[PDB]
């Protein structure tokens, strides 16, 4: 028996020495050296410095450029708003609490951070799904005589918010719970504790099936269909050098987009699953810290991929940054 329990928490350290304290009440300098808490803060700082300019600029640039304000770009803006919830809901709270060495905001702060942070990274996830769907509809032309317009864009965005609430909301009201994770400085969802009073087990599954497998399948399907439709259109007109490049760039990108989706959620899935299936084992705070490192850095690498690598967006940015010129 590996941790120390308490009303709204679970410290991954043994109280046999009697040193363990509430993560809401006193520094956890026995889980990890103080320098490792500082390094945690170093990192949050990095993600705020990189994640906030990149994501905010995206919004700003859309305000300065009329050609960016098209339906096919609503979901990309949604993605940037979501990342901003991650940055302010998640990263800055964790910067502050890490510098105390414990979660100074109490259980309310825990629910709050937990909710917004969770809320942000799910809108992002689902944005990425919705996007592939739209891109598959528009290009693969699966429905005949259909043209994607502003009212589909909006539903797309709203479907994204609804799916997020469908997992950010439950733990606030009984199905699972938010508690400090890892080094106890940031509050996530409890998926590693079997806490029958809230039914952690069933939620963990539902999140796995609905908020992991579904998204994965859809993304793979849509981008499969699309790298297919484009590889075929290119075979059927090799006399176009342009159509040949287009099919090669679209493939390169889809690979990048898929691989980056896995790098972001696969760890969380891999751990969630392996914990679920080795329930009689001890997992360290730094073991819980890993999948969160990968999933959170997506507030930087996602805008890089879906925005800085989008020809339209990139140009407007360079314009805006170079003082109106070039």
């Amino acid at each position: 028996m590996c941790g120390t329990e308490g009303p709204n928490f679970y410290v991954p350290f043994s109280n046999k020495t009697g040193v363990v304290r509430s993560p809401f009440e006193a520094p956890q300098y026995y889980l990890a050296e103080p320098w490792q808490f500082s390094m945690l803060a170093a990192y949050m700082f990095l993600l705020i410095m990189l994640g906030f300019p990149i994501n905010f600029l995206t919004l700003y640039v859309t305000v300065q450029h009329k050609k960016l304000r098209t339906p096919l770009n609503y979901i990309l803006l949604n993605l940037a708003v979501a990342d901003l919830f991650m940055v302010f809901g998640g990263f800055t709270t964790t910067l502050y609490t890490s510098l105390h060495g414990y979660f100074v905001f109490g259980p309310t702060g825990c629910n709050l951070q937990g909710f917004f942070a969770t809320l942000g990274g799910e809108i992002a996830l689902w944005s990425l799904v919705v996007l592939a769907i739209e891109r598959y509809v528009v290009v693969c032309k699966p429905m005949s005589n259909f043209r994607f317009g502003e009212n589909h864009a909006i539903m797309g965005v709203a479907f994204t918010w609804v799916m997020a609430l469908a997992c950010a909301a439950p733990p606030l009201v009984g199905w699972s719970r938010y508690i400090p994770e890892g080094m106890q400085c940031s509050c996530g969802i409890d998926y590693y504790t079997p806490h029958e009073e809230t039914n952690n087990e069933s939620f963990v599954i539902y999140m796995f099936v609905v908020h992991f497998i579904i998204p994965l399948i859809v993304i793979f399907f849509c981008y499969g269909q699309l790298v297919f439709t484009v590889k075929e259109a290119a075979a059927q007109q090799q006399e176009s050098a342009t159509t040949q490049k287009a099919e090669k760039e679209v493939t390169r990108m889809v690979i990048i987009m898929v691989i980056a989706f896995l790098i972001c959620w696969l760890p969380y899935a891999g751990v969630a699953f392996y914990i679920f299936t080795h329930q009689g084992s001890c997992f360290g705070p730094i073991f819980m810290t890993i999948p969160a490192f990968f999933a959170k850095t997506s507030a930087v690498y996602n805008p890089v991929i879906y925005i800085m690598m989008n020809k339209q967006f990139r140009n407007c940015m360079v314009t805006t940054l170079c003082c109106g010129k070039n």
Partner: peptide, 11 residues
């Protein structure tokens, strides 16, 4: 396809 690709920011 090239025109739908451009619109998507894909090419």
């Amino acid at each position: 396809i090239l025109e739908n690709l451009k619109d998507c920011g894909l090419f």
